[PDB]
Amino acid sequence: QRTVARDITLLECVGKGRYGEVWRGSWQGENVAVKIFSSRDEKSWFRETELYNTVMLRHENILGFIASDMTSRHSSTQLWLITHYHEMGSLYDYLQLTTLDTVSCLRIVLSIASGLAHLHIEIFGGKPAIAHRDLKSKNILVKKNGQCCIADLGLAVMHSRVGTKRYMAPEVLDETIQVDCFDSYKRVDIWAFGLVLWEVARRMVSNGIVEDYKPPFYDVVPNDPSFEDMRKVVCVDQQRPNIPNRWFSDPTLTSLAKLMKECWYQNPSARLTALRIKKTLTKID
Template sequence: MVEGCSYSFKEVKTVCCDSNFCNQIDSILTDITSIDNFTIIKKNPQTELWKGKYQNDNVAIKCYMPGASSSWERELKIYKSASSRNNNILRYIGADISRYYYCIVFDYYDNQSLYDFLRCPKNSMFGLSLNQIYMIAYTASKGLSYLHSNIFGADPKPTICHRDIKSKNILIKSICGNLNATINLTPIPRNKYQSDHCINYTKDSNLNKSNNNDKTYCSINCCISDLGLAITDDEDYSSIKLKVGTHRYMSPEILSETLDRLNFESFKMSDVYSFALVLWEIISCYNPFYPNPPFKLNCFHELPYHEFVSQNPSLDDMKTIVVDKNLRPSLQFNWYKSEKILPFLEIIKESWSSNPKSRLSAIRIKLTLQKSCSGMSII
C-alpha cells in the first residue's frame, strides 16, 4: 500500500492511452505490481517521487499524473536512448502505466543528490579536498558530455540537452572508502550478478597518500538525473518554451530570451552555463588545507548568487543580476592556494561567460578535468 494513498498497485488495472508506444516499452519489470514497500519521498503538482523495493533492491519511482502522460512519454523515450549506455546517467529500469499513474522506475541511491551531499554536516565542517572536488566534477561532466554527444550507427543516440542542470539533479551514486583519502578509480571486474551501474573500486598500489598520510582510498561517482525537460536534436525544438527549469540556474540568454532557438548548440551552451554554477557550488566547499586547516574556514555550501538574491528568486530578480548587472558568484581568494585548482577555476570562469559562443563545450570540460585528475593520479 502506498503511504498517503488509498489503494495498492495490485488493485489497479493496467490501462494505456497510447498502445503503440506502450508496446515499445521493453521494461525489465513485468509490471509495477512487482514493486512493494512504497514510501512517498516528494510531491509536485504533476509528479510524485516514491521509493520502493524491487527484487530486494531499493528503486525510485517517478509517477506522472494522467494529465501529464505526454511528459511521461517524452522523458521515458529520452531515458531509453541515453541511460543504458553511460554510467553517469541515472539508470532507467522500467516503466508501467496504471489507472492512476504513469510510472518510470530508476536506480535509487541512498546518498541522494549532490546538493544534499555538499550540505551534510561533515562536509560543512571540514570541507572537501582537492581530489574530492575534482572527482565529483569529473564524473558529473562525463554525464553531461555524454548527453551532448551524438552517436551514429546501428544503435544511435541523439544529442540531448538537459535544460535543468543543478546540484539537485546530480546524484551521488557511490562513496567508497575514506573521504579523507586520495580518490582512486580502478575498477574491479564485475561478476555476473552485478549490473552495469554497479561499479566497485580497488586500491591502487601507486596511490598517492593524502596530507594526513591516510593509507585508505576513496571514490566518489555521480550521475545526472531528471530528464523531464530535456530536448533532442532530432525533434522540432524551434517553438518550445524557453523559460523552464530553475530560475537560479538559467543562463543569460534564457533570461533575456535571446537564445537562438534554431541552433541546437545554443541549448547546449545554456546547459554549460548551468553546469558552471554547479562547479561553483562544489568549489564553495573546497578546503585548501584539508583535512586540518590552520584556522577556521567557512566551507558551508551555498547556492549560486546567494549573496544577491533570496532563496526563491523570481525571473526578474535573476535577470537583473545575471543580465543587466552581469554579475557572477564570487571566487574566494583562498581557492587559489594551490596551482592545481587553477584549471578548475578557469573552467568556471569560461563556462559562465555572458557570450554563449565563448563558453567551453561539455566535452572540453570533461577532457580538462580528466587531464587534471590524471596529473594528480586520481584516475
C-alpha cells in the same frame, strides 16, 4: 509460459514537491527509485518516456532507467518512472553536511562532465545529441563509489515546465536564445554546469578553510527568485558567483575557478564544450 512480477513495494518517501513524489521502493528484493508524477507535470513523464523509447541511454553518470508505467485508475491516469536507487541522495543534499578533499571534488565534477558530454554527443549507428535543460545540484545523485549521475530528462531535447530560474543562462533570461540552433541548448547546460562546479568547489577544503554550502546567487537574489530578479543580476548587471581569495592558494581550486569562468561567458559561443571541460579536468592534479 511466464510470470511477470510487476508489484513494486513503496517503502519510504525520499522527496515531495509540485513535480510529485519520489519513493524508495523494492522489486524482487532490490531497491528501486519510483517517481510518481503529479497531474501538473505529466509532460515531464511523457518526454522522458519518449526519449528512452528513442534511445536506451546506458552510462555510469546517467541515472539508470528501469521502467515507465502508466496505470488506468477509476478517474485518473497514474504515471511512474522507475530508476536505479542511489541511497546517498542528491548532490545538493550531500554538500550540505559533507566537505570534500581534492580527489573527491575532482571525481564528482569529472563524473558530472562525463555524464553531460555523453548526453551532448551524437553517436552514429548510437544516439541523438541531447540537451538536459534543467541541470542543477538537485538533479545530480551521489553514488557510493564517489561518482555522480545526472537525473531528470523531463525537459531534455533531442537533435540528430521551464528550467530552474536560478540556473538559467543569460540568453534564456533575456529571451535572445537562438531556439532553432541545437548548440544553443548545449551552451545553456554549460552555464548551469559552471554553477554546479562553483557549488561543489566551495565545499573542497584547502589550508583548513571551506565555504558553507550556498546555492548560486544566494547573496544577490531571494529564495524562489523571479525571472526579473535573475535577469537584473545575470543580464543587466552581468554578476557572476564570487571566487573566494582562499581558492588562489590552492592549485586545484585555482584551475576550477578558471574553468567555471569559461562556462559563464555572456556570449554563449565562447563557453567551453563538455568535452573540453573533461579534458581540462583530467589534467588537474
